[PDB]
Amino acid sequence: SGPVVATTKLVTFLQRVQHTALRSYPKKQTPDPKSYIDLSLKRPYSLSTIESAFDDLTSESPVPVETLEKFVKEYFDGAGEDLLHHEPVDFVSDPSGFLSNVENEEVREWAREVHGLWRNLSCRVSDSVRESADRHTLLPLPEPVIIPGSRFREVYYWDSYWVIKGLMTSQMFTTAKGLVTNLMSLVETYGYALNGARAYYTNRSQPPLLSSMVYEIYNVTKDEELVRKAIPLLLKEYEFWNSGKHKVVIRDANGYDHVLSRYYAMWNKPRPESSVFDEESASGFSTMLEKQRFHRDIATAAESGCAFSTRWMRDPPNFTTMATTSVVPVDLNVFLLKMELDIAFMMKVSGDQNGSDRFVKASKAREKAFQTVFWNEKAGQWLDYWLSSSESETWKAENQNTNVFASNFAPIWINSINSDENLVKKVVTALKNSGLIAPAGILTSLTNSGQQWDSPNGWAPQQEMIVTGLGRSSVKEAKEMAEDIARRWIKSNYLVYKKSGTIHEKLKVTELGEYGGGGEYMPQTGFGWSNGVILAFLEEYGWPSHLSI
Numbered sequence: 096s097g098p099v100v101a102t103t104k105l106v107t108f109l110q111r112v113q114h115t116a117l118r119s120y121p122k123k124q125t126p127d128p129k130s131y132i133d134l135s136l137k138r139p140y141s142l143s144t145i146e147s148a149f150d151d152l153t154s155e156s157p158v159p160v161e162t163l164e165k166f167v168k169e170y171f172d173g174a175g176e177d178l179l180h181h182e183p184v185d186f187v188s189d190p191s192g193f194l195s196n197v198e199n200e201e202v203r204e205w206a207r208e209v210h211g212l213w214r215n216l217s218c219r220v221s222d223s224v225r226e227s228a229d230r231h232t233l234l235p236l237p238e239p240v241i242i243p244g245s246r247f248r249e250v251y252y253w254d255s256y257w258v259i260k261g262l263m264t265s266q267m268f269t270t271a272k273g274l275v276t277n278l279m280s281l282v283e284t285y286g287y288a289l290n291g292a293r294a295y296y297t298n299r300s301q302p303p304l305l306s307s308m309v310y311e312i313y314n315v316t317k318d319e320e321l322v323r324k325a326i327p328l329l330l331k332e333y334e335f336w337n338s339g340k341h342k343v344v345i346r347d348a349n350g351y352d353h354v355l356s357r358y359y360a361m362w363n364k365p366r367p368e369s370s371v372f373d374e375e376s377a378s379g380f381s382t383m384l385e386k387q388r389f390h391r392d393i394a395t396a397a398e399s400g401c402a403f404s405t406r407w408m409r410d411p412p413n414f415t416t417m418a419t420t421s422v423v424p425v426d427l428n429v430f431l432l433k434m435e436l437d438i439a440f441m442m443k444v445s446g447d448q449n450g451s452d453r454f455v456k457a458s459k460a461r462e463k464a465f466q467t468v469f470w471n472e473k474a475g476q477w478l479d480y481w482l483s484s485s486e487s488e489t490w491k492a493e494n495q496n497t498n499v500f501a502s503n504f505a506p507i508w509i510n511s512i513n514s515d516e517n518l519v520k521k522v523v524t525a526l527k528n529s530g531l532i533a534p535a536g537i538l539t540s541l542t543n544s545g546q547q548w549d550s551p552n553g554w555a556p557q558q559e560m561i562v563t564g565l566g567r568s569s570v571k572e573a574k575e576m577a578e579d580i581a582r583r584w585i586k587s588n589y590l591v592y593k594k595s596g597t598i599h600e601k602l603k604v605t606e607l608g609e610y611g612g613g614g615e616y617m618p619q620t621g622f623g624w625s626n627g628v629i630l631a632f633l634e635e636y637g638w639p640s641h642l643s644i
Contacts, residue, residue: 244621252301261627360394404548475525507564535587553604
């Protein structure tokens with residue numbers, strides 16, 4: 096197995112507690128395993144003290160539930176207690192000109208409620224996290240954050256882009272900048288932005304949206320110091336994705352070599368936040384080497400931002416055939432194309448012609464890759480490319496994944512693509528006939544697997560990329576389809592909220608007004624990128640007073 100980034104003593108000790116808890120509880124009422132890895136040490140006790148008592152308490156071959164809860168109450172501060180509520184300095188309950196293009200007053204007022212939830216998601220690490228970080232798995236960060244919500248008690252990487260799009264609508268550019276400052280601090284420390292700001296995430300990244308967050312903020316604020324600070328960190332992240340295990344080389348039929356990226360977690364064990372579920376998932380493998388490959392493919396699917404999906408399974412829907420490190424993903428390489436486009440822009444506005452030139456050349460190269468490696472004329476969409484081996488290889492047609500995913504349409508987001516009329520029409524036709532267009536939005540896949548990144552679910556980021564892309568074209572049919580999807584998506588979210596008073600992580604887009612589920616954890620509410628896409632969609636499209644419920 097390739098590189099592994101070690102975790103901390105605290106995390107491996109909290110995994111011990113986690114194992115004891117799940118062994119001691121009944122299956123019917125077991126707590127969210129991740130909440131044990133989110134504990135912190137209760138002052139004044141040291142790790143050495145607490146572990147010593149834990150060794151004594153478990154010095155018998157199960158621990159009674161009552162004794163375990165007493166122990167956890169005694170020596171730890173609960174999950175989330177070191178993540179304090181923070182009032183955003185830029186939050187305003189009813190901003191002047193907020194969603195002024197929304198004529199339907201019922202829509203506008205519900206959107207103000209959604210906007211109001213930014214307060215709920217706004218947090219800051221406690222002083223103890225900064226003073227003595229070794230007592231927390233929550234990492235210290237320089238600025239307040241926006242979290243996804245519920246069990247996600249920490250900032251996440253790619254979520255923050257769609258959060259920022261909503262923050263812009265919400266007139267919260269100080270909070271928006273704070274997110275990017277926090278993610279830039281992680282790149283500076285680790286070399287990449289972590290999956291999330293927890294010690295058990297230092298081994299991997301997530302879809303690389305940081306350059307897009309910096310671009311969207313600067314495009315409004317013209318904060319020149321931000322771009323000056325961002326450029327070397329974006330260059331560092333760019334090298335991270337274009338080197339080592341993340342870099343792959345695919346030669347096409349005309350013999351041109353294409354440099355592309357894959358996901359690759361630097362981890363080959365159970366994820367500490369899911370330790371027992373991951374062990375259970377791997378229980379059928381006979382050899383430790385098989386377990387390690389699988390655990391790395393699992394952690395790599397977490398790096399994809401899309402854990403989990405038939406998309407990453409060699410033999411779907413068999414979860415044990417997860418093979419994420421073998422996939423050259425469409426959406427990942429869209430984001431790297433976007434990085435090249437953003438970095439060329441920033442280097443131009445900062446006055447660096449040579450750097451701008453270098454990244455125009457790069458984006459031009461990856462544009463070629465999309466036309467040759469990913470595109471499929473017959474399917475009218477872009478397909479993930481599955482590696483033949485681990486070493487450069489030659490493109491084979493049978494290695495495109497012909498299965499149908501919302502991510503297959505991610506490249507429509509890119510301007511060189513959505514500016515191409517005759518390409519856009521082919522993609523429109525493919526999307527219309529794909530079966531991904533459902534009553535509430537775009538299905539993330541067509542296979543009902545039991546996993547959350549599969550049918551019947553749809554997901555805010557994937558809606559936004561397709562809607563923005565189609566909506567940027569000049570093709571009337573694309574623009575009308577984009578608006579229709581946006582309004583179905585808004586409506587379903589409005590209907591879910593009337594029943595639950597919450598915004599959900601994912602929707603069951605096969606049915607209007609239903610939230611989605613699946614996967615190893617219960618449906619979560621908040622919800623960062625879901626709120627952001629609702630607000631961004633309403634800003635773009637408004638809601639005419641005549642159209643309604």
